[PDB]
């Protein structure tokens, strides 16, 4: 199935890695296959059947019978052992060594994991989804995670300073395309780095029970800010809806970093002029990003206010009772809203 | 056992940190209990009795015994090593890792901090008073301090320009509540950030011997200015005494940011009408700010002059021998005071 | 060899550090010792005699041969191997470990550079001058140097602005004690930080071949600035001489920072009324400071002009040809000085 | 502390051997000094004084502290750990290596064994009594033990068939010195090889608990045969007394292979003319061996009858009453003696 689900099960703490480390410290080989179907049974021959509940020591001891062990897809039922796996000898494989050739060919024929641990060494190999992947030690994972994290707060500092510059320019509004789109591309690139580090966090699983904590405490409200900026900044006669936001996010994720750093591509994702003067073109915020800072506000009334106003300049020039004129808005609530708005203009 | 005393005890330069860094270079784990008592004895079982003076080499060598190194109360006497810990497991535990769980359980059992270093990773944790913390590398804390120092100079410059404007108003006295109170409003935050950075400075201890001098040069006379502004800018029948000043500053430190960003809450803090028009209310300064800059001036003379005058206008308009007629004021001493007042009139 | 000459030989690029690195990558012990006296032979035993030219591989192999290698005092010819460095047990040593205890006692008995690399780690150790210095990886050195560069460049900024203010004031000279020695305090601070970064670059050697560029670009003229300020400003009836200037320089260097931040001590080093009533005392500039800005001008001319004038205000009031009236001065040559000095007023 | 007592103490089953195997499985070093005298205390310095009860796990843990582990003289307490071994360097040595030279010097300075288990290696070394012994794997010990038990059993077969031939020639009243003392020739060398087997068995200890019973069932009665033959076949006026028999035993044991393989030397040990005619000479027998095979006999009665008769011919010529007429001999025993003698005469 999915590589970043079999690796997730292959995260430490899970019983599978308990068995794997038991095998590794026992200084012996292993050939573990997860799952059972018609094709797995059809290929595997010359092996016993156990039909017992998975335990950490069953795998460790059963690996010693000089053969492959076939499991249940949930890793619960050990229903085959000692078996030689004899897949189609026509499937192309590049490994050298009968153990690894069999592992790769079986993983190609049936998509289930075929984990191989070479004897006399400490190497764990995963053959999921037609990609070989040596299991690395936690030291290298943590080291590369540390470098990526450091570069991540570098990105965070840059993005935060650009965002605060945008906020300052907005609260005395004179806003062009360049600053907004630089904010957008910084947000997209920090999102990409966040996703990569999240994949690394999934790979760690539980040994590094701090990387996701640092991601939460550093990246923060990335997705909410992304949604707000997409809903606000979109060149359409009317503000986009949730479906349009999702479509724009999909388009942004589809384009690569080369298109991410290209201003024209980001312009045409929302839909902007492609001329060099578009970057010099100025526009006013719909207000979503600016007034999102006010707490205890529901999105329905936010959208209603945006529809009733249209631009952030209208809200800035709104009278004391102008907000009360909007449907569904009370007197004290609107008066309490202006208290936050008033301090922002300072 | 407060957190910000074990943090100081673990600061670089202290021999305990030397032992810790040697252990870190050893690529092996640690389990250090900075205290022994009857509860520790109940937990402790199956170990050696050493009673040797502390040495980073000795600590590094003992930390290879796969157990617990039980230092004395002050962390200067090794008492037990290779001691297995059997704390009560009924108490809640949220740590991920048997060693960390046992260490936290022991720290809950007795009021002694416990430090654990994971095997093959350079992490270090503190379990003081039930609080979980990770001691970070000098690079991260130095970067954080450098980042916050910029906001420190920004706050100091804002307070400086506010104070200069206030003094320019004073020489042609016309005082409103907002102008006379924004100085304290900035003083509170600058002192809060000063103490926040000083916590990091004392955490460094000796490694970051530049942040201490930076805070020395940047904070300046923040405390004296705060005390004098409390003495002067308070609408009370009589100038505040030492007890009154202490109570008011304690109230100022008690209030949170929600009680700080609003000048009106601060107005109730000093004691003022809660009406909005009170922001435009006027009052006569005691005169501390203008004449506090006179060189070779004792605070007792300042307080006596404030008590005998009660306003800055009387001091400014004081005649040549008006100050000399005040009891305890000599002839030459009185002349020098008026020299500053006449010069400051520009 | 001094401590900061052994560290220089142990700086990267040097052949000895190359051999140390080859040993470190070889993951094997090494006990390399430098020098050849009667005591080195009287302690070493159990080894061969070679007399072949030094190379990066000879020490590596003879260290792989599980013994201590002895080297010529210049580290150029190898004449022992395999030796067992056996000093007396009378010399105290708190290290735990036979190899390192032998290295420490060897260094104490014979003040020579003995290198004690431990296997299973990447640690390089030297026990010279009564202390052991763990040679650090380039990362930590670069980190601390980069941290120091920020403080030092802030210091150059403070010096330049304070000194420019003092020079502009001295154009219409009215001198106060605090104003005349704040410049000296800041100059001594920047000198001390320059020396500290010099120690860092000495221990760094050639991997960080950029901090020398930073210092050369930044500090520029500091020792000449100290010389000029002491020569121009030194209250004593006879003109200060080179010996007197140097003596004052090491007198300043002898002062502690606690002694540096007190104006009384800095005054009595130069020689001033130490009373608190001399803070407003003023004196005329001797002529070194302001007039030293003239390009293509020798120091002997400066000294003879000072002898002819003895002050700077009289130079300001000097005519255009009285400079020519000075011995050894022509007309057109003197016209250059007056034009430059006149432009110095603004 | 003999070599073949500490070798036995190191044999499997002994807790010391269990601790040694625990250390070996841990792939860590050990420098274990079996004993604690004031000289050892004068050599051991720089460590922890423990004085705890011995346990294999305690030894395994202490061996990780990278030093010397001094056990008590009987190997019951671990009373020093991580102590430095600084012996007298004036002691001559042939080893080359700090551990292997310091161990030998400590062994020479005080005769206690110094077991060294070099890390990452499976080798165990013993330095007892001034020679070096390497503790071997049990497989080689069993291999050599069986290889030599085979030649022992073939020696025993030749010995007892020659003894049967001697008995057959003995009951004819003709005696030749060569036939008499070739049995002693066989017996001495069989005793030597038996001592070799016993040394191998002591080295094994408990793993090879089959060689001991193999010895007990092959060597059979050897000391009794030796003492009986030396008491019977000796050229002296009267049969040797217990002290005389014992002295002849050590005289026989004193000679070496080159002298045992020579018939004349062994004859001279008995006491005989140097001529080869003595080999052809005929002597009377004391009858000890001939009638020693009779069951239910008392040594005192055998000695009394031999003294009263002197020769086996007198035993043959003795009547039923004559044996009973001898004091201390019963009537039913007298006929039984002849009954066995009559059977032996056939």
From Swiss-Prot, chains A, B, C, D:
PANTHER family for this protein: DIADENYLATE CYCLASE, DNA INTEGRITY SCANNING PROTEIN DISA
Annotated EC: 2.7.7.85
Subunit structure: Homooctamer. Interacts with RadA; this interaction leads to the inhibition of the diadenylate cyclase activity of DisA.
Role summary: Participates in a DNA-damage check-point. DisA forms globular foci that rapidly scan along the chromosomes searching for lesions. Also has diadenylate cyclase activity, catalyzing the condensation of 2 ATP molecules into cyclic di-AMP (c-di-AMP). c-di-AMP likely acts as a signaling molecule that may couple DNA integrity with a cellular process.
Residues reported to bind ATP: 67, 85, 98-102
Pfam families in the record: DAC, DisA-linker, HHH_2
Protein name: DNA integrity scanning protein DisA
The protein's enzyme class: transferase
Domain DAC: 1-138
Gene of this entry: disA
NCBIfam families hit by this protein: PRK13482.1 (NF010009)
The organism's place on the tree of life at top rank: Bacteria
Protein family membership: Belongs to the DisA family.
Source species of the chain: Mycolicibacterium smegmatis (strain ATCC 700084 / mc(2)155) (Mycobacterium smegmatis)
Activity regulation, per record: Diadenylate cyclase activity is inhibited by the interaction with RadA.
Reaction equation(s) it catalyzes: 2 ATP = 3',3'-c-di-AMP + 2 diphosphate
Cofactor(s) annotated in UniProt: Mg(2+)
UniProt keyword list: ATP-binding, DNA damage, DNA repair, DNA-binding, Magnesium, Manganese, Nucleotide-binding, Nucleotidyltransferase, Transferase
Something else known: Overexpression of DisA leads to cell expansion, induces cell aggregation, and inhibits bacterial growth and motility; coexpression of RadA rescues these abnormal phenotypes.
Induction data: Forms part of an operon with radA.
A GO term for molecular function: ATP binding
Gene Ontology biological process terms, A to Z: DNA repair
